[PDB]
Design an enzyme around this catalytic site. Structure first.
Site, mmCIF file in Angstrom:
data_model
loop_
_atom_site.group_PDB
_atom_site.id
_atom_site.type_symbol
_atom_site.label_atom_id
_atom_site.label_comp_id
_atom_site.label_asym_id
_atom_site.label_seq_id
_atom_site.Cartn_x
_atom_site.Cartn_y
_atom_site.Cartn_z
ATOM 1 N N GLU A 206 -0.647 10.309 -10.389
ATOM 2 C CA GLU A 206 -1.107 10.589 -11.625
ATOM 3 C C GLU A 206 -0.003 11.042 -12.432
ATOM 4 O O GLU A 206 -0.217 10.991 -13.860
ATOM 5 C CB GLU A 206 -2.033 11.729 -11.352
ATOM 6 C CG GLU A 206 -2.813 11.871 -12.504
ATOM 7 C CD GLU A 206 -3.964 13.068 -12.234
ATOM 8 O OE1 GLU A 206 -3.642 13.945 -11.657
ATOM 9 O OE2 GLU A 206 -5.329 13.119 -12.479
ATOM 10 N N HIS B 83 -1.412 1.056 14.989
ATOM 11 C CA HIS B 83 -2.462 0.065 15.696
ATOM 12 C C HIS B 83 -3.422 -0.261 14.503
ATOM 13 O O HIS B 83 -4.517 -0.673 14.499
ATOM 14 C CB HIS B 83 -3.180 0.735 16.606
ATOM 15 C CG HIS B 83 -2.415 1.316 17.807
ATOM 16 N ND1 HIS B 83 -1.937 0.636 18.929
ATOM 17 C CD2 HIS B 83 -1.717 2.620 17.701
ATOM 18 C CE1 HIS B 83 -1.252 1.200 19.767
ATOM 19 N NE2 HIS B 83 -0.974 2.448 19.138
ATOM 20 N N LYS C 233 -14.283 8.867 -17.948
ATOM 21 C CA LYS C 233 -15.142 10.075 -18.212
ATOM 22 C C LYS C 233 -15.982 9.650 -19.701
ATOM 23 O O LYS C 233 -17.211 9.894 -19.455
ATOM 24 C CB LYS C 233 -14.372 11.234 -18.341
ATOM 25 C CG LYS C 233 -13.552 11.613 -17.269
ATOM 26 C CD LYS C 233 -12.760 12.949 -17.456
ATOM 27 C CE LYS C 233 -11.705 13.273 -16.271
ATOM 28 N NZ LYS C 233 -11.145 14.504 -16.680
#
Lengths: 515, 515
Positions: free
Chosen positions: B319, B348, B453
């Site tokens: 960010e 793994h 937004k």
């Protein structure tokens, strides 16, 4: 974009699952160029289910599709073996939940906690299904030991406290030689002796036949044992006893999981690519990454219950496709990086870079239409619920990303159900298998984990030479302090000076060497 | 390689923190060429600490370095408000833990649970610090609401069960207008009112002064209020009231956390690059990514308590650095993808692709010397404890990766303590800020997160327009079924037809429409 969305929208009638690839920018000629390779993938996958050796590197069959369709298993000893294990899990699960099988002496009388010990697919799978499908207050809570960190296992034992007397420990390992899984069992058995508890009367093993863990569970007389097969890689073992048993021990309908995966495998066997959802995912991966893994696959589930989906796909995708050598021996460093957490939480994290930062990725949204259990819905603002916001964030993010030339796939389920989760596991298992055929690699072996396996064994071997060379200072009358170059030459490992420094640096911090 | 390791090792004696970038293959030409750019970053960082306008795009100050050293605040008022908050947090947490501040009526007579409602930096930080420093059995257990998913909030409420009567609800938002945080607060208040509880006597607000949430909590009479300052970004707010309160409420020594953060920032001001550990990380990032973020940063901490480190670092790095425009208006799509979980569990999972797959990454190992609480260490086999395997897994992976030209960084702490976590947080904050100067970008604003937004608000406003059209058609006596094209036209927006289909699809699944 509307005409494109309607032309490519895949809808499955029964499962209520949808695949949208309209926000992938694949061209007209790209479909025709990928048609011959897609037909080769369907024929190679057809012989995989028939029992052919589809893992030539380990010389083994690849039959994780038989776990959900026992009829497709080739011989009778396998169709009945798979069916008797499902019934064995269902019988043993209902005996633990109903309290018919008890710990010797506990406060609740019945088992109430689960301590699953396993690593890789033996934990990433069970952790994903548990967070996705378990009831709020399940018949048995679950905890996981997925590492060889002593502080983590000690922390789990401390929080477990006095319910260890009501904990059913599950050890999941094909051979019992996995260093982390063996370390876990050894640490837990030491904790059971410190509490004066017989581990065997509270232990369960999920293991291949006649292995080191099977013999231990048989000889020490544990509660029960469940089989693992070599044609079932841990990467695709969620619908085997690895995942079915822990899920059924929490009240999850595992039969519905097998059904959802079964209906999903039928759609993925379709030879028409536009109607094949596993082919659509593989096409978009191929287009977005240019077939060489040039971009990362960002998984954004917009549900709290699917938070562990991406790191489950990290094993299924990156370990299956991150191969160095092409199926014809040529050096081809394939792979497909996967990361991501959850929406809309990740919008306040790294979507800043996703929207306007370096374009090195493509997104795969996972959407869930139903918001909450029925009878809990209410409006926060006029006409809009709490779930409508979650829906709006996904659609706004999908739109804000594509507006800056960032492509995305949308996978939609109606509700997070045993049937739907089993369908999502089957969907990505086939999409990975088809993608490996497009890039011409074996998706079912693990050659890249061998190098770290040997280098880790050489460190432990080097540590004992350090202790051997040092106990001269402990027990020889010419007691004297060895310099780093002096520990090294006497170990006859002079070039390993750096590793010797890190070895004694670790032992000095744990009261096992003096500096 | 041993000579390079000895030459470049950084140790910070008081903290016990080491930084090893020997396995980064940057040349001496790189160090000679980056020296003018590095010294410019040190000057800019000094002006930033003195109070200059470091966020030029918003006209604000960047002063998260004042959170751990109030003396270097530009005025006495800011210094006073920082120190009064720490005293306020300590006294309130001690009174909560000791039981001097009680719930109105509970079974235990004391607060026992924490429900932290926050998003982005308001949750990632407290989640990371909790899992890394909280005791095995804390004075108060903690839960996090960090999303607008109604199923997850109802899930946390259902698990909380009867202990909701003794839950301390913390609401974290700057202005109280964050949609996710707002919806979570409304859902929690509904649960409190359904159980017959008063939220005011169990609620605490962390807000900017005289915002909507600050005025509401003061007028409704919540338990307490804590300040959130405008010169502190969300991703660098861990050592403010955002992270200090939930940590201190779990019995964590937040004073030592500030000490280590301050001790770390003293060293990250050193002008000599070879002894500036924030410069060592910034250079290694710049080298591996060649300045333009062409490689991902895989963060592999080999300790279970540090599992949430990469998710925290995902926000701090991706960010701050994923910016579209240079500080001079030039279009540079900067960025630095971050992901990873923990070792040796990730071995793994995707080390297969890391070892021999696509070479599009570099690794950062976090090693911890103390592997076990004192008094718990025992030897599994002769001469090797459980921690020796953990240590060997890390050294084996670091070696096996470097052999195949996969570069790495090694960060070592002696133990995961309050002081070490604060220092490790402060190390990455300065390293990110220094790296932003190298690429000439602004690391303290978030222009790219607004488009999602805003587009999310357009969808909800469209839903309310769709609902008006449907309710008009449903309140004709001759009832009127409508098609997607008709609905888009009566809403007078035929281009939005694709979003209308998704709105209706999501509403039909929640029993709010029929097909």
């Amino acid at each position: 974009l509307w005409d494109r969305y309607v032309e490519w929208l895949y809808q499955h009638k029964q499962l209520g699952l949808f695949v949208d690839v309209s926000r992938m920018g694949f061209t007209d000629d790209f479909l025709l160029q990928m048609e011959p390779l897609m037909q080769r993938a369907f024929v190679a996958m057809g012989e995989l289910e028939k029992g052919a050796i589809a893992n030539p590197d380990e010389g083994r069959m690849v039959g994780h599709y038989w776990l959900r369709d026992p009829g497709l298993a080739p011989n009778s000893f396998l169709r009945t073996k798979i069916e008797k294990t499902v019934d064995h899990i269902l019988a043993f699960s209902q005996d633990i939940v109903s309290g018919k099988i008890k710990p010797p002496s506990s406060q609740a009388g019945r088992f109430t906690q689960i301590l699953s010990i396993g690593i890789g697919g033996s934990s990433l799978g069970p952790q994903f299904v548990s967070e996705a499908l378990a009831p709020d207050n399940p018949p048995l809570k679950i905890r996981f030991i997925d590492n060889t960190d002593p502080a983590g296992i000690d922390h789990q034992i401390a929080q477990l406290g006095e319910e260890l007397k009501s904990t059913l420990v599950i050890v999941i390992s094909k051979s019992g030689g996995t260093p982390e899984t063996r370390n876990g069992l050894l640490e837990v058995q030491k904790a059971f002796r410190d509490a004066g508890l017989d581990f065997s009367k509270q232990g369960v093993a999920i293991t291949q036949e006649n292995s080191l863990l099977d013999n231990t569970a048989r000889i020490e007389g544990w509660l029960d044992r469940f089989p693992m097969f070599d044609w079932v890689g841990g990467r695709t073992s969620e619908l085997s006893a690895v995942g079915l048993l822990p899920a059924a021990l929490q009240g999850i309908d595992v039969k519905e999981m097998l059904v959802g995966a079964a209906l999903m495998d039928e759609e993925t066997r379709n030879t028409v690519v536009k109607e094949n959802p596993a082919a659509l995912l593989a096409l978009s991966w191929y287009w977005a990454t240019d077939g060489i893994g040039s971009k990362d696959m960002v998984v954004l589930p917009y549900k709290d219950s699917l938070l562990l989906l991406s790191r489950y796909l990290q094993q299924l995708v990156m370990e299956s496709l991150g191969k160095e050598f092409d199926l014809d021996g040529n050096r081809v460093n394939q792979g497909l990086t996967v990361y991501g957490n959850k929406g809309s939480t990740d919008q306040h994290a790294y979507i800043q870079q996703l929207r306007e930062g370096v374009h090195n990725f493509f997104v795969t949204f996972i959407e869930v239409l139903r918001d909450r259990p029925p009878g809990h819905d209410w409006e926060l603002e006029p006409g809009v619920t709490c779930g409508d916001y979650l829906f709006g964030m996904l659609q706004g993010t999908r739109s804000a990303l594509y507006s800056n030339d960032r492509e995305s796939i949308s996978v939609t389920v109606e509700e997070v159900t045993p049937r739907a989760v089993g369908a999502l596991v089957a969907l990505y298992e086939r999409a990975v298998g088809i993608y490996a055929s497009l890039v011409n690699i074996n998706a079912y072996h693990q050659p890249g984990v061998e190098a770290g396996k040997k280098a880790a064994g050489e460190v432990l071997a080097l540590q004992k030479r350090v202790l051997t060379v040092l106990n001269e200072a402990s027990c020889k009358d010419p007691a004297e302090p060895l310099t780093l170059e002096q520990i090294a030459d006497r170990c006859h490992c002079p070039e390993d000076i750096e590793m010797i420094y890190k070895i004694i640096q670790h032992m000095a911090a744990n009261d096992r060497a003096l500096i």
